[PDB]
Design a protein around this ligand. Structure first.
Ligand SMILES: *[C@@H]1O[C@H](CO)[C@@H](O)[C@H](O)[C@H]1NC(C)=O
Ligand SMILES: *[C@@H]1O[C@H](CO)[C@@H](O)[C@H](O)[C@H]1NC(C)=O
Ligand SMILES: *[C@@H]1O[C@H](CO)[C@@H](O)[C@H](O)[C@H]1NC(C)=O
Ligand SMILES: [Cl-]
Lengths: 428, 428, 428
């Protein structure tokens, strides 16, 4: 097993009772690493074997206020009336503001729909067909509608919190996998308890991301977005609604937007509509779960405290700590370093991209361990299994043609592998 | 007294002036947790008691450049002059640019204020009241003003750093509360010194936030904003000024903006003003201190290193570490586990929101300790005091009606509590 | 030789054979701090000296998808044709959309460039030079182009990862300097190995930054930007291209933009172009490296991964951890505390700014150590050398005139220093 215990002590704890007790500290346990502790009673040379393993440490999205986003399509129309016809009596009437409708539009329109209307001056003379010679009125409105009724629920991730899953193997052979309470001792067997002291992750300053979920396809995505109530043009949430029903038809009462998302000019007798709306569907496709951002792999979650869980691809970039309290027993450790040799089969993917290149490598390891791969461009560490298995790791490059040598290491035994491949650049 | 010492050692330290010394390691102490260390001399058979407690670990806003924002109101005006009247003598004069003013606007306008002017062509013939038939001139200006003179100071938080407040109890009973220097030993009494080794915090990737302060009400807020010199439309700082005085009237001499924050459409005989300005008063009211963002509660600070200090609601998400060096003394520990039972009195607030629901719980604790509450949807941990006291904890829910059971745990003694209440969804 | 070892233990390590081994834990080592370990054999007076030092811990930009940004300038043109001249036969022809070009534009236009065209009505009657009285047609196009051919490559930093550099001094005096792999033991000499357990940095929630590099000057900057494919107006990346070739002339096949970055006002016979494009050169100039953001100094990197390395100015805000495994040897430590006295020579710079004021201080230290400076306005810590040297440190103030007392400390020896200076406020 692995070298995980880095401190062992005999302590005198009191309440006035006082008992001599043993206490071991495991300060840095990466996921996949395993400690094997043996406890021997005074009378019997037999040892009880306890195994302590960090199965996984998940990053959980700590959400802010959620909102809904419709699949918006731009729309507009316009009608012109002479200076003595219709509502246009001596210019634009004062009541025709941004939420006004004209009876001369004749097109099917949602009176409760989200949009922006207005009155403006048009051509006047008889050369454009008006008895009056002064300029006329052009009643126009630009608005958005949601055909197909596609809706996403957007939840910005205000922060990310580690959630550990530990695996403890009893001397009886029973395996207990659970999310531990930090600082709370877990009684494993007679005289011995295990306490999870907390988690550490070396990745910091993660860019702002949001959980995006389509309400009737249930597909998940993770991408930047606006906070609830914000409408910065160019991001998901520029059009947002406070409920699913409001987003179904984009109603005024529940949705907000920036009216400049639809461009409208005013010609003599028509209007051209220029959609400036950012496609939420295109963002959901590009950022679809599973995805890799900032060296963190984000996938669908196996628990209920968040549908998305994250973890670094470099397995040594996140760690747990343990305290083992044992009384009436003597501690011994099972420790051996690992060895591994490797060959890389293919190197494909993209360079200077968010995902990073994909390096395929087959590797034989003497035991379950952690393999390290270090190039001049990037480094990573991943868990490997005993025997011969193939692995696909993510390494970043900044050039198209890759032909360099990198180092491979398990437990201090260093080897070399050959990366030969070609990478592409993604469009924006 | 809690279980905080996880390693104790006897060392041989030299300077060669070699001395045998003891050193205890406290690697993970949450705020509210407390260690009790007893030291006995080889001669005297009784102990001196030293108590080490992490009172608080505060997150301090590491500010970038600050700026000032006014309570801005959109505004514009326009006048139309025939081609042989007024300054319009030969169409729009080239000198009349974005900072030019017309003496015909007839408004008590601030000629030093931030805004944008311009001249455009209008209706020409006698059909719109001009003897000349060539097209007239429209002198217009869109600008922004600050009635009531309300100003906010905005300081973007480029990063957050932990600031620990530790509390040492001497055998004399004297309590010393101070912010320790990491790595600097603090002499407590004869032969013993304690050293703070640093702080750890698990919440990562916190969204960009800014300290916002009203200048003559002093009320604080924490919300997203532009950096200094940036003017993204839709966030605080779209209009920003380099001094309090320039923001009082929004002077062009010290303020910057995007002129598209105000839309102006030119029609004959008047112009309509489209306000696209984000209400800073609306943002500061919603994000008012105290506020809870991403599992962190931000409140007014008790020190002088910034007016806002943050801390995780789950107190086990932040921790400090100590080293205790003792010479000529034998270390013994006071350690006892806590038990608690509780009942939940009220469950109110919102769901799927930034702050989270509020769970009120009466709890009896056998000692100062940490209580854990784990539900199927969320989990938290909070400090409790000895005896019967009431607490208000924040738990997140994604549905309106809450009627479920959750687990309560102090020191590995688990009981159950029932949550009943109704929650509302926040509007954007 | 500082006090870095906080735990030493004797362990029984097995693989049926077992062996007794010593293991020392160094849980918190700041940059510049050094541990001195001495190993003696039971029957031998020969002592072997081992020095463990953290040279520095660097933050590395974990890059997202890269893109290219040109130095764009606004441009537009316009022509007007009477109702029966040119393409204007029956009003504006429908086949003239945003990507159309009129053959009557005088200046030569890049028909493959990025821009936006359109047809609009204008003055009609003989008062503006047309026989027909119906409104004429105005053919216009607003676009951007890249004179001088200046291009930047932008790489958003999705996250930051620490990268430690340690140096080990052998008993032979040899110094071995390398970036360690976390968890991999480094054999130093017979019976002793050193393992790096990981890095902790207390700075969290760092604002989103991007690496900006001019392709032909190689100058670097670090500033906020748009993600790849995003075009929020007001940030770097509002105009972005997927290749250096597309950015050389701002072609449409590879670049994207928001057409509202160029404003066009169509008047009777001319067109005026309004540029609201954010100057990238101004951002790269202001944010040029080396720069200080959020208490972290970002400088040109000395390694191969990334051109930029970050590190806290407060050296106690980042730390490494070591484990020393030694067999058949007894451990003894060399530990001396430091003393230092100092006086500040000059206090200049800005207040309420991202960089903070710069404080120059001459300081006499008895050894290599860490000096702490505590004011009521700010606190920092920096590495000092043995002897008398001058240091420049960054401390933050919120007022213009500084007249306050501050405290200096090395190894628990506290004195006082008197900062006096004047600071200025930066414009937006
Ligand atoms: C190695 O890992 C595999 C899969 O997790 C497991 O089945 C096997 O028992 C492990 N080997 C050990 C624990 O020796
Ligand atoms: C429990 O905490 C309170 C306030 O934090 C303190 O006054 C009291 O002395 C503590 N009880 C102990 C240390 O036994
Ligand atoms: C002090 O630091 C300097 C520079 O880091 C180094 O050259 C010198 O050897 C150090 N002194 C020691 C290790 O005693
Ligand atoms: Cl972080």
């Amino acid at each position: 097993c692995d070298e995980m215990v880095h401190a062992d002590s005999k302590l005198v704890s009191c309440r006035k009772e006082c008992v001599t007790t043993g206490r071991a500290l495991l300060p840095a346990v990466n996921p996949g690493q395993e400690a094997c502790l043996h406890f021997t009673a005074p009378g019997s040379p037999d040892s009880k074997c306890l195994k302590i393993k960090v199965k996984r440490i998940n990053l959980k999205c700590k959400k802010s206020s959620s909102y809904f986003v419709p699949d918006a399509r731009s729309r507009c129309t316009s009608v012109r009336r002479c200076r003595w016809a219709g509502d246009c009596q001596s210019g634009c009437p004062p009541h025709f503001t941004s939420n006004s409708f004209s009876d001369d539009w004749a097109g099917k329109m949602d009176r409760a729909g989200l949009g922006f209307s207005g009155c403006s001056d048009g051509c006047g003379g008889a050369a454009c067909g008006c008895f009056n010679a002064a300029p006329s009125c052009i009643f126009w409105r630009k608005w958005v509608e949601n055909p197909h009724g596609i809706i996403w629920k957007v939840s910005p991730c205000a922060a990310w919190v580690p959630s550990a899953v530990i695996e403890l193997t009893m001397p009886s052979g029973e395996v207990r996998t659970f999310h531990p309470m930090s600082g709370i001792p877990t009684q494993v067997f007679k005289g011995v308890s295990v306490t999870y002291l907390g988690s550490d992750m070396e990745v910091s300053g993660l860019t702002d991301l949001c959980e995006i979920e389509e309400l009737k396809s249930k597909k998940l995505a993770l991408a930047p977005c606006n906070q609830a109530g914000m409408g910065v043009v160019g991001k998901v949430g520029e059009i947002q609604c406070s409920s699913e029903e409001s987003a179904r038809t984009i109603k005024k009462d529940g949705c907000i937007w920036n009216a400049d998302l639809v461009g409208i000019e005013l010609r003599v007798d028509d209007a051209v509509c220029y959609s400036k709306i950012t496609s939420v569907e295109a963002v959901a496709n590009y950022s679809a779960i599973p995805t890799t951002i900032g060296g963190l792999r984000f996938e669908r979650s196996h628990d209920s405290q968040g549908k998305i869980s994250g973890s670094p691809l470099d397995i040594t970039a996140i760690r747990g700590s343990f305290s083992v309290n044992y009384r009436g027993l003597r501690l011994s450790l099972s420790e051996i370093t690992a060895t591994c040799t490797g060959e890389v089969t293919n190197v494909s993917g993209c360079y200077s991209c968010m995902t990073g290149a994909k390096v395929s490598i087959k590797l034989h390891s003497s035991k379950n361990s952690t393999a390290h791969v270090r190039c001049k461009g990037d480094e990573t560490a991943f868990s490997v299994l005993e025997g011969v298995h193939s692995y696909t790791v993510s390494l970043s490059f900044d050039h198209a043609v890759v032909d360099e040598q990198c180092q491979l290491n398990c437990g201090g035994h260093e080897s070399q592998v050959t990366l030969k491949g070609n990478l592409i650049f993604l469009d924006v």
